[PDB]
Amino acid sequence: KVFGRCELAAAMKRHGLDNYRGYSLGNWVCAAKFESNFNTQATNRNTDGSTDYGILQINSRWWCNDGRTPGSRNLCNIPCSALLSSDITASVNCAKKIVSDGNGMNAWVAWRNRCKGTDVQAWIRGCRL
């Protein structure tokens, strides 16, 4: 599934991401835009053998188990195929662990490269909330 911008903002707010661990909702929308172009099926392979899964590109080395990644830790305790669902609940629940791990949203390269330091509130502008 490919989400619309406001459609995803509403969905992420329902799941408690707004201001979660100090990060306003626009952060999460902006990260999803540049991590996955709002697509729940985006996947990307890395040089370390890991893969990034789903709308928030959760990485198979630390967070989810995909059965093909050496050194897997599965800190979210979830198979990576559950993060390719059209329903974002499992991606959101894993994202909440990741941000509480220590370095906040810096785990998302696209967020810290192209979102952080801009006005991310603009990503929820005009959305029914």
52 catalytically annotated: yes
Q: Which of 18, 48, 52, 119 is catalytic?
A: 52
- Partners of 31 in the beta sheet? none
- Method underlying the structure: X-ray
**CA–CA dist 30, 5 (Å, integer):** 9
Q: What is the CATH number of the domain that holds 91?
A: 1.10.530.10
Nearest partner of 110 among 20, 21, 13, 33, judged by Cα: 33
If one counts the domains in the chain, the total is 1
Where helices occur in the chain by DSSP H, the ranges are 5-14, 25-36, 89-99, 109-114
Alpha carbon distance 69, 89 (integer Å): 23
Q: Is 48 a catalytic residue?
A: no
> 70 is in which domain, residue-wise?
1-129
Pick from 66, 65, 83: nearest CA to 74: 65
Residues 70, 52: Cα–Cα separation, whole Å: 14
**Of the residues 35, 48, 66, 87, which is catalytic?**
35
Looking at the DSSP bridge assignments, the partners of residue 44 are 52
User: Is 101 known to sit in a ligand binding site?
Assistant: yes
The dihedral of CA 55, 83, 28, 115: what is its sign? Answer: negative
